[PDB]
Amino acid sequence: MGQELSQHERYVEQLKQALKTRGVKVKYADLLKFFDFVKDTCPWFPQEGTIDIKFWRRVGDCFQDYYNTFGPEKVPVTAFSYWNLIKELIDKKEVNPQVM
Secondary structure (H helix, E strand, C coil): CCCCCCCHHHHHHHHHHHHHHHCCCCCCCHHHHHHHHHHCCCCCCCCCCCHHHHHHHHHHHHHHHHHHHHCCCCHHHHHHHHHHHHHHHHHHHCCCCCCC
């Protein structure tokens, strides 16, 4: 964290609790990074921050939902291509997530 918790940020924390009951186990920082990536989709083409591979699964499903909801405009095939580049950056740097 390290950032003030606004009413909107507090809602996400409660949402994460419900996700845990559904069977989700990810770091809280990953949730904050998720919002940053979404803003990078259009607002800033360049990416910034390390993305956890475990959370990547949620992004793939979340982005797919937005695609059908709106279309390729919100998340086109560029999202997958850009993610492929990120996978290499994180894959090159060894990390120790929750497990292994």
